[PDB]
Structures are given as structure tokens and as C-alpha cells.
Coordinates of C-alpha atoms and ligand atoms in Angstrom, one line a residue:
X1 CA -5.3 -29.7 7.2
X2 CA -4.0 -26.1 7.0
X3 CA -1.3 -26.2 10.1
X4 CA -0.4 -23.5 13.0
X5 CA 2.7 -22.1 12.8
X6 CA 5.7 -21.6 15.3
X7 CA 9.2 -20.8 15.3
X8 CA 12.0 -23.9 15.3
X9 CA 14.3 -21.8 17.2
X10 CA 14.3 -18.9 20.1
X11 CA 15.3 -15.5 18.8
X12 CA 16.5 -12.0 20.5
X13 CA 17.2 -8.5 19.0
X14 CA 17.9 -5.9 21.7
X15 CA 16.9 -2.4 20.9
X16 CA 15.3 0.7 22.6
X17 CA 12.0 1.4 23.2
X18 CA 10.5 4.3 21.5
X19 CA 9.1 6.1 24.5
X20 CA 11.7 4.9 27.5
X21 CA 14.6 5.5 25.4
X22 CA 15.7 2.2 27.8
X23 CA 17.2 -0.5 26.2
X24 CA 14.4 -3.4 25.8
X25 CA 15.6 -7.1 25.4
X26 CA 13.0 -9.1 22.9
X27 CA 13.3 -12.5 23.0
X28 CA 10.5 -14.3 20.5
X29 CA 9.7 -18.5 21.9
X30 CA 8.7 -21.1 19.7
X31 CA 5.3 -22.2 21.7
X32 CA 3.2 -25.4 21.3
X33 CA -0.4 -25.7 19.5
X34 CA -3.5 -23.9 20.9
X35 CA -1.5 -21.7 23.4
X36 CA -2.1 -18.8 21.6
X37 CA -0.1 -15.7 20.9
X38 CA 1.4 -14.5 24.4
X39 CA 3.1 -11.2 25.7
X40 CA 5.3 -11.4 28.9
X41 CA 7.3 -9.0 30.9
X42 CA 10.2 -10.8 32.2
X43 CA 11.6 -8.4 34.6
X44 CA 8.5 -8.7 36.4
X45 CA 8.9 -11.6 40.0
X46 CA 6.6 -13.1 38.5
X47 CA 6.4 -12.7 35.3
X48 CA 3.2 -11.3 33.5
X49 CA 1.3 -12.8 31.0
X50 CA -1.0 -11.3 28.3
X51 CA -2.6 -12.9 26.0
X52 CA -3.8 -11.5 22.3
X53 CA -7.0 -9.9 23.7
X54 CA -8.7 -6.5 21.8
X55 CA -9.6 -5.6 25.2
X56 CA -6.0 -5.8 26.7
X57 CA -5.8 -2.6 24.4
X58 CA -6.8 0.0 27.1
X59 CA -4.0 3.2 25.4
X60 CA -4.0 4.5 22.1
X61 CA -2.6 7.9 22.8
X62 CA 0.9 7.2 21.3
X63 CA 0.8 3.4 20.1
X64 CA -1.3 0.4 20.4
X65 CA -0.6 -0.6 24.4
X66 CA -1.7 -3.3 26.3
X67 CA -2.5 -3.0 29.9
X68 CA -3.9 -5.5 32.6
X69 CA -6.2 -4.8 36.0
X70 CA -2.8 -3.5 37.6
X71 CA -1.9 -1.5 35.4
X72 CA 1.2 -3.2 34.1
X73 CA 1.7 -2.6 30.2
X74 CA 3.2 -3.5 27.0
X75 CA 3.5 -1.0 24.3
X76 CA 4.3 -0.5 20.7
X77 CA 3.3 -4.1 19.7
X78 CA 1.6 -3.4 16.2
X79 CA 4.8 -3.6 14.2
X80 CA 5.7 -7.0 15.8
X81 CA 2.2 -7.9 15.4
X82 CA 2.9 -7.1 12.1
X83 CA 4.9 -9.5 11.1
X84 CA 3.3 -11.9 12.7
X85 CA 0.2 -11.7 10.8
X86 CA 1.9 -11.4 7.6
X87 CA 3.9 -14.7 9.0
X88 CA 1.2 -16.2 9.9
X89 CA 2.3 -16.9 13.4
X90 CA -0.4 -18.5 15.4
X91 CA 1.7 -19.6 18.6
X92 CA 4.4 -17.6 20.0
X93 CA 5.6 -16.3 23.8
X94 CA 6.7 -12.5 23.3
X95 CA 8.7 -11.7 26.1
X96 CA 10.1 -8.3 26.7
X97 CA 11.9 -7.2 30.2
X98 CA 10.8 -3.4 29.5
X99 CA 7.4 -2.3 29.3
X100 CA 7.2 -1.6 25.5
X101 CA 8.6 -4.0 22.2
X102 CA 12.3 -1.9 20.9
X103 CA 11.8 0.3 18.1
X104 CA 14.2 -1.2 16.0
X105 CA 13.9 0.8 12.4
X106 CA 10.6 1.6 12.7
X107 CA 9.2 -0.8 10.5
X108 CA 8.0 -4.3 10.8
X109 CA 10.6 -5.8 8.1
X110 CA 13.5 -6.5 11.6
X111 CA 10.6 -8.1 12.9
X112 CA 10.2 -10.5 9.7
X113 CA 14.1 -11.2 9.7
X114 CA 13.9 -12.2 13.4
X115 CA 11.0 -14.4 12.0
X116 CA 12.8 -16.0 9.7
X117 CA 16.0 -16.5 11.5
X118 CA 14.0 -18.2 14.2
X119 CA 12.2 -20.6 11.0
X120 CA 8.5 -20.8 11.1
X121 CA 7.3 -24.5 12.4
X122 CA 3.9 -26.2 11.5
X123 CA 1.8 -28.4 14.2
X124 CA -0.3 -31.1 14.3
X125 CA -3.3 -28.7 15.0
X126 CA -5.6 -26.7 12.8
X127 CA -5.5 -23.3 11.9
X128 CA -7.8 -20.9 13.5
X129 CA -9.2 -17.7 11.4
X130 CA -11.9 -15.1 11.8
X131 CA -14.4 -15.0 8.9
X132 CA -16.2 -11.7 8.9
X133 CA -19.8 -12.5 8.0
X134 CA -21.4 -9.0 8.3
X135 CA -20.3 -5.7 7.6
X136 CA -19.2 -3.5 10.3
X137 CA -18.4 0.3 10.4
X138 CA -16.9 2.2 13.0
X139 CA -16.9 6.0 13.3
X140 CA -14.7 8.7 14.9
X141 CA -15.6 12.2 13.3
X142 CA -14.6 12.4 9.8
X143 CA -12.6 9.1 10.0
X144 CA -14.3 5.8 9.9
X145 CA -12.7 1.8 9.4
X146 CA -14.8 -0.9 7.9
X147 CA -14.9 -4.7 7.5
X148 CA -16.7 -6.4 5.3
X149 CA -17.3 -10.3 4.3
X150 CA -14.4 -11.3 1.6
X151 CA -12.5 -14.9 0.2
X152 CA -9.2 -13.5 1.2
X153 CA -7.7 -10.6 2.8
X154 CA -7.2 -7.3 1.5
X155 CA -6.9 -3.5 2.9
X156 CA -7.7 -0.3 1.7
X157 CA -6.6 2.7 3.3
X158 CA -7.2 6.5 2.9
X159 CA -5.1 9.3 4.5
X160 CA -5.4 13.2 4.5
X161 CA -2.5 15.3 5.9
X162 CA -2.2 18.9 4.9
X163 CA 1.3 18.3 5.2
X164 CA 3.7 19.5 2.2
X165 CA 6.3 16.7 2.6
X166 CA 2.8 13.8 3.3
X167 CA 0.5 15.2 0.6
X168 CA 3.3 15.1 -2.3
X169 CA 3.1 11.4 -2.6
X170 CA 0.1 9.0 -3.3
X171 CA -2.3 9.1 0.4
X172 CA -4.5 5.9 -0.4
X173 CA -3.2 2.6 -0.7
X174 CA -4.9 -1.1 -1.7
X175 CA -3.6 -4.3 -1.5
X176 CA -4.6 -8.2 -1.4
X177 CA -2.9 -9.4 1.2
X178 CA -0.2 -12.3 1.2
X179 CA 2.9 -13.6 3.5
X180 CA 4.7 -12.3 -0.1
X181 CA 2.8 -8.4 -0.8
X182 CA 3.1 -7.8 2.9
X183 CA 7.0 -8.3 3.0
X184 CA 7.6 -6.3 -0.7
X185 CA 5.2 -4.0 -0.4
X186 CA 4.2 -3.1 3.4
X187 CA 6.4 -4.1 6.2
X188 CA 9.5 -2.1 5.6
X189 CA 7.4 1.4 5.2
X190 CA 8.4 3.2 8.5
X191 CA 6.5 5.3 11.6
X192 CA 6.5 9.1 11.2
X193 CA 6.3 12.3 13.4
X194 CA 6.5 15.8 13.2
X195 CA 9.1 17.4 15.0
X196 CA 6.8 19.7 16.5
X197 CA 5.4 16.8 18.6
X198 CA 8.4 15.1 18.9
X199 CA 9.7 18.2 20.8
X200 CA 6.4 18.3 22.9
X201 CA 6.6 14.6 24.2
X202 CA 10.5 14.6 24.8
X203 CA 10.2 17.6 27.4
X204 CA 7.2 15.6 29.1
X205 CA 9.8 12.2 28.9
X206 CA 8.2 10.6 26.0
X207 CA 9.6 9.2 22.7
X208 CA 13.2 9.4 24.5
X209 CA 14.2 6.8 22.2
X210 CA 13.6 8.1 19.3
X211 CA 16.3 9.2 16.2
X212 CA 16.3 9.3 12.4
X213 CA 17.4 5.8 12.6
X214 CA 13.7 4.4 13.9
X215 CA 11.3 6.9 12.0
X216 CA 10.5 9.2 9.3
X217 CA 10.8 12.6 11.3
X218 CA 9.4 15.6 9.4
X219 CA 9.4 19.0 9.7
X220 CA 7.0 21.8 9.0
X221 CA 7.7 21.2 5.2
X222 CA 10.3 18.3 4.3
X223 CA 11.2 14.9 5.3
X224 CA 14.5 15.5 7.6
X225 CA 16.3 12.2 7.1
X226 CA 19.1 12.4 4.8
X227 CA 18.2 9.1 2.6
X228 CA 14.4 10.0 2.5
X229 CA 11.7 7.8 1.9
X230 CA 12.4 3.9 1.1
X231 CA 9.3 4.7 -0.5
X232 CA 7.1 7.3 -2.3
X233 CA 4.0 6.8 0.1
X234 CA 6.2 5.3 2.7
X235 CA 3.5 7.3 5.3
X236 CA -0.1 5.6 3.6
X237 CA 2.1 2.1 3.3
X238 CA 2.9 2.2 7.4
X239 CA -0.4 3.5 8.0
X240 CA -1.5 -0.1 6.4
X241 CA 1.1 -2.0 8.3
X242 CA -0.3 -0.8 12.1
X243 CA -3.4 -1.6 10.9
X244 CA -2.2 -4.9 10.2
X245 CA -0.6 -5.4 13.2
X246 CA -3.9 -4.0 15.6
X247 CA -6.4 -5.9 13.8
X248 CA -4.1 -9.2 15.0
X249 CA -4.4 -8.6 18.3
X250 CA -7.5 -11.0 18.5
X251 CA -4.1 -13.1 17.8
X252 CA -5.7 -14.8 14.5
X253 CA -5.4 -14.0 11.1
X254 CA -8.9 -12.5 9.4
X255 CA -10.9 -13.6 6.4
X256 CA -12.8 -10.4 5.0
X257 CA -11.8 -6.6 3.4
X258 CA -10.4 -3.9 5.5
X259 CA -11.4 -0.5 4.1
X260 CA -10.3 3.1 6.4
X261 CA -10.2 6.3 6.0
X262 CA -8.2 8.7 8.6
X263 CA -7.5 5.5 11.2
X264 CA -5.1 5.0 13.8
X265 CA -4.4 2.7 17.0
X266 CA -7.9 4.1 18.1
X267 CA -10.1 3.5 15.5
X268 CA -8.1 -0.4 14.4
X269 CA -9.3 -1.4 17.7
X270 CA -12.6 -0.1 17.7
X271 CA -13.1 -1.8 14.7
X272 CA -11.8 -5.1 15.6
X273 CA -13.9 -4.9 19.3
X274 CA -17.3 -3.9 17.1
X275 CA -16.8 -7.1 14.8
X276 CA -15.8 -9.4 18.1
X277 CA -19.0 -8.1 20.1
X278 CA -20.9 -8.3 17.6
X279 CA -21.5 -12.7 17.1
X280 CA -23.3 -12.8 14.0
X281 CA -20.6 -10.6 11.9
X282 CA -18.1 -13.1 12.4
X283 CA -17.3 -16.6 13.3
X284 CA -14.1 -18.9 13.8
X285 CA -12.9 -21.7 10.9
X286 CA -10.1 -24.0 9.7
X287 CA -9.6 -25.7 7.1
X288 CA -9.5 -29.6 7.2
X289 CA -9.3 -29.8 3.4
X290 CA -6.4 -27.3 1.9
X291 CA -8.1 -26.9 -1.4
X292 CA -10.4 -24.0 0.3
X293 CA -8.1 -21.7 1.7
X294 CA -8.4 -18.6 0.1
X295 CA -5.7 -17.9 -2.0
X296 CA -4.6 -14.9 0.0
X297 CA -3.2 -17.0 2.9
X298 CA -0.8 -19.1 0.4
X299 CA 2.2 -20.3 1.9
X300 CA 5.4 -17.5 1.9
Ligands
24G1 C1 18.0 15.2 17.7 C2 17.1 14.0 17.7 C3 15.7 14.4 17.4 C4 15.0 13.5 16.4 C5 14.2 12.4 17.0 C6 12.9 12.2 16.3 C7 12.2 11.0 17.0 C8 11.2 10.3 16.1 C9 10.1 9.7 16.9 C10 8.8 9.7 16.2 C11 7.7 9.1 17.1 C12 6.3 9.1 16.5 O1 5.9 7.8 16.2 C13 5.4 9.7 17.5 C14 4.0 9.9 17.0 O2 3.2 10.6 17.6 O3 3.7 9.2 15.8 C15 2.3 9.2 15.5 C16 1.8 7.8 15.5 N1 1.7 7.4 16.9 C17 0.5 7.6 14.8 O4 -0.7 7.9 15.6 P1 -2.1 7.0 15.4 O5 -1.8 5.8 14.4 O6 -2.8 6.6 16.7 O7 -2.9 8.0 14.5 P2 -4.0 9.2 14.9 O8 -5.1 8.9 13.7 O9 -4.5 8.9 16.3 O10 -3.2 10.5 14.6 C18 -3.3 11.7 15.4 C19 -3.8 12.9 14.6 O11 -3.4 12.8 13.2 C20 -4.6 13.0 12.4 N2 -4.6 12.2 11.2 C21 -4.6 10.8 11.3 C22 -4.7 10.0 10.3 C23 -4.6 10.5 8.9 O12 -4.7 9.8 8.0 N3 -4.6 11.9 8.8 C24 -4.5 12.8 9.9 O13 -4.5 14.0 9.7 C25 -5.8 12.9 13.3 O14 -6.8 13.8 12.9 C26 -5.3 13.1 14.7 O15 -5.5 14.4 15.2 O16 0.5 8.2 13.5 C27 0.6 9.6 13.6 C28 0.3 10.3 12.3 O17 -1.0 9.9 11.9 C29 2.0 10.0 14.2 O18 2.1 11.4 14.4
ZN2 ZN1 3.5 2.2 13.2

């Protein structure tokens, strides 16, 4: 029986969060089988609770956020959801006393670490996934995001900026997906912005914690940070990684191809609630017998 994962140990990192520019205490608990992935705000009397739901995503404006019936949120959680996915983490209480997840670099690769430190745990309980058993499309202008059945995992995405600095490198990106290609290949690429809406949303009070230290910042024509790109498509391989870390906010890892052109927080999660409304293009499994896990969910 393929197992569901936890961490042995509790973990913190401390950072800021990208639009409070407050410092945000993370603390990752190791959780028993069938609880489920859960989000909690601590400095809440009581605490809140939510769990990995696609409709808990009610704001896409800046990042993926989650918000309740009193409007009490948790944002930025798709790079954390990131490298869970990649992980494999089934189990896990996310707690957070600020309303969003700290920035950290701006990638999903502290995230890992954190992971790691903690050491992932199996239990005595089978391994829930979401087959995709129809294709679904979802449409948004000129951008569109697709699912389609598949013996694995693996993601395929397009962009098109008319950027100088964005257009120079490679703007589609494919991988199969494993614990391994996601940690080398994906989840140290890092968010981007333009400094012409960085400027916007920091007079409004947003992205107050941002610096060159969590984010690719860009200007009209160049890349600003002094180091560059940890990558040549650093922008298409991030792009990848938040759709990564959206789609597993049904809290399970999918079975079936990922294919997008021009998506974002938006569009991930219109996806991901099309294929959960719609019953026939999907269905739970496990695997009893470890000879038929797809080869894409291999052990890290
Ligand atoms: C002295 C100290 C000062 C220095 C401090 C600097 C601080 C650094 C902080 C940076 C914070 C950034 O993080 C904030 C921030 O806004 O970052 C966002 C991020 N949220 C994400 O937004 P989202 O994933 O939802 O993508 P949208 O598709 O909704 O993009 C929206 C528009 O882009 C078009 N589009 C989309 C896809 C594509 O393939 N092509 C293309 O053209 C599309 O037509 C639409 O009009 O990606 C965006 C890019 O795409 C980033 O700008
Ligand atoms: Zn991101």
C-alpha cells in the first residue's frame, strides 16, 4: 500500500509576508492520517481552521488567498503548496499568526528545506489521488488551462509577455512531474513584478514586504537584481510552480496532464473547480498494490 505522508518533527521559519510587510511566524505540524491538509491562524481566540478546499479560494487579485464566511484569510499559499505537492504531503496543520504564509525568497525551494528538516513520515493509511478521467478546458480571453486523463503527472505551460527582459528567454516550459524534477528544475524559480506595479500597490499598502531578496523585480527593460536569474526562464519555470501549488489546493496530489497558456491564480482555480464539479471527469484512488503507481509519483 502506497502510504500518506507527514512530517516526524514540527518546523518554523519566520519571515515577512509579501503584502503586510509584518513579520509572519510559520510553524508546519506533523498531523495524523485522513485529517487532511489544514491552514490555521493562530493569533486568532480561537484559532481558525481551513481546510484544502478549491472553494476556500475566494481572491486572486495578487495571490492565491483563502477566505472563510467571515472573511478571515490566508494568503500567498501556492509556493508552500508547492512543496507540498512535490513532497507529497498528504497531512499537515499549517499554522500562520498573520494573515498570509512569509515570502521567504520567493520560491518554493525554503519551503522544501523546511520539509526536509521536519523528515517526511509514512502512515498506516492509503494514499488518496485525483485521476482525471475527462478532459476539461477552462477559458479566460485569450488564456485558457486544460486537464486531460494521463498515467503520471506532467505540466505544460505557455507565457507571452511583451517584455524585453521576459521575452529574451525560453516562455514555454514541459515537464513530467516527480518529488526529484520538481526540486531541480521548478521549485527554486522565483515570483516576479514590474516595478511599475510594485510602485502602484506600495502607495495603496500592498506588497510592503517586498525587496530584491523575495522576487525577480523588473523594470521597463532589464531584470534589476544584481545576480539575475537562477535561471534562464526563471519567469515560465515559477509560472509552473503556482500552478503546482493552486492545483493542490483540493489538498491531493493529481493523476492526469496539465497544459496552459497565459494562466494565473485565476484561471489554476477555475480549472481545478471545473474538473471537481464536474463528477465524471474525475474520481478518487489509492493504490493497495505499489506495482501501479505511475512512475511519476516515485519515491524522492
Ligand atoms: C526599494 C525597494 C523596492 C523593490 C521592491 C520590489 C518588491 C517585489 C515584489 C513583487 C511582488 C509581485 O509578486 C506582485 C505581483 O503582482 O506579481 C504578479 C503575480 N501576482 C502573478 O499574478 P497571477 O499569477 O495571478 O497572473 P495574472 O495571469 O493574473 O497576471 C496579470 C496580468 O499579466 C498578464 N499575463 C499573464 C500571464 C502571462 O503568461 N502573460 C501575461 O502577459 C495578464 O494578461 C494579466 O493582465 O504573476 C504576475 C505576472 O504574470 C506578476 O505580475
Ligand atoms: Zn508565485
Amino acid at each position: 500500500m502506497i502510504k500518506q505522508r507527514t512530517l516526524k518533527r514540527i518546523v518554523q521559519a519566520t519571515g515577512v509576508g509579501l503584502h503586510t510587510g509584518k513579520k509572519v511566524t510559520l510553524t508546519l505540524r506533523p498531523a495524523p492520517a485522513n485529517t487532511g491538509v489544514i491552514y490555521r491562524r493562530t493569533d486568532l481566540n480561537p484559532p481558525v481552521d481551513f481546510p484544502a478546499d478549491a472553494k476556500s479560494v475566494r481572491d486572486t487579485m495578487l495571490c492565491t488567498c483563502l477566505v472563510n464566511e467571515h472573511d478571515v484569510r490566508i494568503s500567498t499559499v501556492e509556493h508552500l503548496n508547492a512543496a507540498l505537492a512535490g513532497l507529497g504531503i498528504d497531512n499537515i496543520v499549517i499554522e500562520v499568526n498573520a494573515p498570509e504564509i512569509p515570502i521567504m525568497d520567493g520560491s518554493a525551494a525554503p519551503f522544501v528545506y523546511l520539509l526536509l528538516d521536519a523528515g517526511i513520515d509514512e502512515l498506516n493509511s492509503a494514499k488518496k489521488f485525483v485521476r482525471i478521467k475527462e478532459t476539461v478546458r477552462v477559458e479566460d480571453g485569450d488564456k485558457w488551462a486544460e486537464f486531460k486523463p494521463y498515467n503520471g503527472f506532467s505540466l505544460d505551460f505557455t507565457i507571452d509577455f511583451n517584455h524585453p527582459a521576459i521575452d529574451s528567454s525560453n516562455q514555454r516550459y514541459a515537464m513530467n512531474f516527480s518529488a526529484d524534477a520538481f526540486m531541480r528544475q521548478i521549485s527554486r524559480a522565483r515570483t516576479f513584478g514590474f516595478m511599475r506595479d510594485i510602485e502602484y500597490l506600495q502607495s495603496r499598502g500592498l506588497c510592503l514586504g517586498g525587496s530584491f531578496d523575495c522576487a525577480i523585480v523588473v523594470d521597463d527593460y532589464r531584470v534589476l537584481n544584481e545576480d539575475g536569474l537562477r535561471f534562464e526562464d526563471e519567469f515560465v519555470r515559477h509560472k509552473m510552480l503556482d500552478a503546482i501549488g493552486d492545483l493542490f489546493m483540493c489538498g491531493h496530489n493529481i493523476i492526469g496532464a496539465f497544459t496552459a497558456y497565459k494562466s494565473g491564480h485565476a484561471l489554476n482555480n477555475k480549472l481545478l473547480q471545473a474538473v471537481l464539479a464536474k463528477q465524471e471527469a474525475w474520481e478518487y484512488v489509492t493504490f493497495q498494490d505499489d506495482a501501479e503507481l505511475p512512475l511519476a509519483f516515485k519515491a524522492p
